[PDB]
């Protein structure tokens, strides 16, 4: 149907906007601490601690499959990156501190993303 196509075009355009958001957030992680999944070879107990691991590569796979239907879903995954790190790692670590800085810097980007998503529809 034409309605299905129009809905698909909306999803495609959201995907474009979320790719630009993802790029901007990942720039706020210049150490590449959140770039890839925590390795279960290197941290064998991880899944005893963290029930829903997340990382930027995994988000990018989801995004390229047009797997985010709305901004809330995308933000959920970004918050997992931050929140998982702040639980597994202590306050005094470079990992926790990287997550704080990513959260604070990313807030700015996400605040305008939400306006754009609402504005363009």
Swiss-Prot record:
<protein>
    <recommendedName>
        <fullName>Bromodomain-containing protein 1</fullName>
    </recommendedName>
</protein>
<feature type="domain" description="Bromo">
    <location>
        <begin position="9"/>
        <end position="113"/>
    </location>
</feature>
<comment type="subunit">
    <text>Component of some HBO1 complex composed of KAT7/HBO1, MEAF6, ING4 and BRD1/BRPF2. Component of the MOZ/MORF complex composed at least of ING5, KAT6A, KAT6B, MEAF6 and one of BRPF1, BRD1/BRPF2 and BRPF3. Interacts (via PHD-type zinc finger domain) with unmodified histone H3. Interacts (via PWWP domain) with dimethylated and trimethylated 'Lys-79' on histone H3.</text>
</comment>
<comment type="function">
    <text>Scaffold subunit of various histone acetyltransferase (HAT) complexes, such as the MOZ/MORF and HBO1 complexes, that acts as a regulator of hematopoiesis. Plays a key role in HBO1 complex by directing KAT7/HBO1 specificity towards histone H3 'Lys-14' acetylation (H3K14ac), thereby promoting erythroid differentiation.</text>
</comment>
<feature type="cross-link" description="Glycyl lysine isopeptide (Lys-Gly) (interchain with G-Cter in SUMO2)">
    <location>
        <position position="41"/>
    </location>
</feature>
């Amino acid at each position: 149907s034409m309605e299905q196509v129009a809905m698909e075009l909306r999803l495609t355009e959201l995907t474009r906007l979320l790719r630009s958001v993802l790029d901007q957030l990942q720039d706020k992680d210049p150490a590449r601490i959140f770039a890839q999944p925590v390795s279960l070879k290197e941290v064998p107990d991880y899944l005893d601690h963290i029930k829903h691991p997340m990382d930027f590569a995994t988000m990018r796979k989801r995004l390229e499959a047009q797997g985010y239907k709305n901004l809330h879903e995308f933000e959920e995954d970004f918050d997992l990156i931050i929140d998982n790190c702040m639980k597994y790692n202590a306050r005094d670590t470079v990992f926790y501190r990287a997550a704080v800085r990513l959260r604070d810097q990313g807030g700015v980007v996400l605040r305008q993303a939400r306006r754009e998503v609402d504005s363009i529809g």
